[PDB]
């Protein structure tokens, strides 16, 4: 029951001929599965971790200028030179300065003036990469057995460390069976080019070419003891005031500039090893061996009592906590809902089949009633506990919310959203292929466009579609305008 | 600032976004607009740091 009240869950009910269902585990969002004859169990991502970090392009963020030296040559007899300039430890650039009888020349004329300074490393900022092999994924598995206090519990569950070596794993649940996990870490994220840019006590996710494009001097990135920098002219400026001398300044500390720069980067944790959060992984669930506990259990007949208050969570599901009062340890709980005093029995018991394992402390049921005002009974007889409920909303509202949720899923998850909750249907695969090619062509156009610019481009193209002449107007307008507007509305999040 | 100085147009010296204070050097400056420098990040739901 780790999934209750998370604000991001999504029901994925369904199976296939050989009983697999695939699902993308968005980090920080847990998916819940259902079946006619299988237990409803909850899956949540946790702690995509890495090891054996490889470092390259160790940057520099603050300089230190020492050993200021300068050399001048008389006008019109060649450029000034310094034997010290060749060494890579020196930054040096020559301007022109007028040279006169007042500063010891032969004749009045412009002359070269090299000035060199000893750039020194200070507070380097390293950016490491990850060997793709070292990526490690952990998936927690919680089944919906109601315990005394297992509501949204996070430590409870069974970990399954899934690495690209062990793409397939078992999951030995207590007295339920083995849940199969087929995975595909290759398409989790393009980790072939991510860089883990570690700050003082922070670390981030960046794109490779952007990282190579940070306008700061860079080092070899190896474990050397005396790094040699390149493009050292960036962190040092030369002040040539009205052409009389040359002084050198170190241009301060670019820390805040960096913190402002990474305005779209995600976050990880750096504590010994780094547990990189913020990633999605698809997993083809295998429901081969799951079997319900207490299928042959006897349905007990006695009165029930409502220990805790009924309280409904977001997006339509309610929690019932009830303790059995009787003598049947193997009891299974009866359930039926009658709205309008009819026999409709409409709705779904979201939990598989609740059973009272032990009498003393309640086992808590979860169920999803229909939209209309519907009563819910539990036991049997006159004293059978009956609970009224009134869910607010209509079916069209649920449809609209589901559509919006699916759109948000598609925009963030790219081309894998069609793999989400699939069965293997021929229609679904073709839709995924078409959306994949179209979206790849689309994002090829907008690699690097921002919030407001995407909104404005969408407005411009929806206008050019609206007033155009030939039948391309509808294709351009609908497709590009709607896609760009809906991406501008929900991005950077 | 530090060992360096500059001349900037006055109208531009209040519109650059940073915290600012009365400049009374009373050892306990109560900074106006402290929100601009410090930044809150909220992870996926849950806590806040």
């Amino acid at each position, epitope marked *: 029951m780790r999934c209750v009240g998370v604000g991001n869950r999504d029901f994925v009910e369904g199976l296939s001929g050989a009983t697999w269902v695939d699902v993308v585990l968005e980090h920080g969002g847990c998916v819940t599965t259902m079946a006619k004859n299988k237990p409803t169990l909850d899956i949540e991502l946790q702690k995509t971790e890495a090891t054996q970090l490889a470092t390259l392009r160790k940057l520099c963020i603050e300089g230190k*200028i*020492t050993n200021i030296t300068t050399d001048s040559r008389c006008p019109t007899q060649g450029e000034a030179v310094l034997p010290e300039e060749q060494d890579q430890n020196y930054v040096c650039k020559h301007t022109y300065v007028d040279r006169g009888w007042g500063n010891g020349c032969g004749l009045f004329g412009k002359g070269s003036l090299v000035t060199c300074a000893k750039f020194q*490393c200070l*507070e380097p900022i390293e950016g490491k990469v990850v060997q793709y092999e070292n990526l490690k994924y952990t998936v927690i598995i919680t089944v919906h057995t109601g315990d005394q206090h297992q509501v949204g519990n996070e430590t409870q569950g069974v970990t399954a460390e899934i690495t690209p070596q062990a793409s397939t794993t078992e999951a030995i649940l207590p007295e339920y069976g083995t849940l199969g996990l087929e995975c595909s870490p290759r398409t989790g994220l393009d980790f072939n080019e991510m860089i883990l840019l570690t700050m003082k*006590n922070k670390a981030w996710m960046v794109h490779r070419q952007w990282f190579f494009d940070l306008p700061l001097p860079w080092a070899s990135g190896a474990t050397t003891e005396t790094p040699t920098w390149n493009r050292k002219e960036l962190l040092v400026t030369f002040k040539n005031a009205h052409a009389k001398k040359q002084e050198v300044v170190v241009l301060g500390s670019q820390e805040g500039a960096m913190h402002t720069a990474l305005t779209g980067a995600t976050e990880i944790q750096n504590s010994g090893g780094t547990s990189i959060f913020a990633g999605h992984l698809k997993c083809r669930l295998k429901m081969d061996k799951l079997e319900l506990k207490g299928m042959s259990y006897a349905m007990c007949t006695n009165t029930f009592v409502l220990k805790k208050e009924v309280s409904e969570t977001q997006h339509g599901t309610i929690l019932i906590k009830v303790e059995y009062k009787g003598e049947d340890a193997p009891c299974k709980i009866p359930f039926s809902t009658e709205d309008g005093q009819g026999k409709a029995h409409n709705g779904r018991l979201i939990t598989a089949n609740p059973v009272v394992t032990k009498k003393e402390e309640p086992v808590n049921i979860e169920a999803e009633p229909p939209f209309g005002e519907s009563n819910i009974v539990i036991g049997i007889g006159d004293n059978a506990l009956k609970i009224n409920w009134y869910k607010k909303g209509s079916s069209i509202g649920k449809m609209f919310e589901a559509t919006a949720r699916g759109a948000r899923r598609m925009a963030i998850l790219g081309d894998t959203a069609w793999d989400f909750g699939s069965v293997g249907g021929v229609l679904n695969s073709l839709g995924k292929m078409v959306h994949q090619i179209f979206g790849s062509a689309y994002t090829a156009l907008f690699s690097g466009v921002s919030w407001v610019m995407k909104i404005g481009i969408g407005v411009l193209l929806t206008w050019i579609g609206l007033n155009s002449k030939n039948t391309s107007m509808s294709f351009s307008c609908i497709a590009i305008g709607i896609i760009t507007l809906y991406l501008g509305a929900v991005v950077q999040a | 600032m*530090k*060992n360096k100085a500059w001349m900037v147009h006055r109208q531009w010296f209040f519109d650059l976004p940073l915290p600012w204070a009365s400049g009374a050097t009373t050892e306990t400056p109560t900074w106006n607009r402290k929100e601009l420098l410090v930044t809150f990040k909220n992870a996926h739901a849950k806590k806040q740091e």
Partner: antibody
Amino acid sequence: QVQLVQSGAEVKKPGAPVKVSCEASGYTFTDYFIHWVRQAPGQGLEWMGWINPISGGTNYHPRFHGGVTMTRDTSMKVAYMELKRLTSDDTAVYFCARGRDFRGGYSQLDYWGQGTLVTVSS
Amino acid sequence: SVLTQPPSASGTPGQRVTISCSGGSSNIAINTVNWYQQVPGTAPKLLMYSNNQRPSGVPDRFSGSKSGTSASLAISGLQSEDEADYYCATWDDSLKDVLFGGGTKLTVL
């Protein structure tokens, strides 16, 4: 409490590298500085360079870049300094001190160790 | 620039003697000065962990501040146990290094 053992004094010959270990426990070592100030007999003491344990590089005094090196480890909370070249000049006791990262606190050397001593001779 | 402080003598009767520290326009005129006294032969301790703030040094008799390019320290009721070398150290911001002084041989009679 917070202190720096600074191991024990050792003396060597010219032309070889010597090491001075310097461990400070009792507090979170990451945030604070290590300064490595040298002190000659009957002379004033001059500071050379910081080392930030978490991410810091060497920032030696202009007299001493390319003359000394500084390393550290975060797991054991110890800062290492070694002398890549021993001339006849460096005949003194080398220190450690905790420094703050405040602009007014770059010279804030609140805590000091015993002082590992090294001299060079034939 | 670079800081230079003079060595001087004093006597065990209580008297105000000023250990003046002189610097420049980039090292001490803008930054917090730090005052150290060392018992000879061992590790120097810190006497003033701010411009005019003492962490745990002998209170009410060790107090000083800085004026423009000069920083100073004042000691009152100086006895023999205060035999120490006094150091003023300031952070140079142009050269990105702290600037320790030569040292004062403060001898008290």
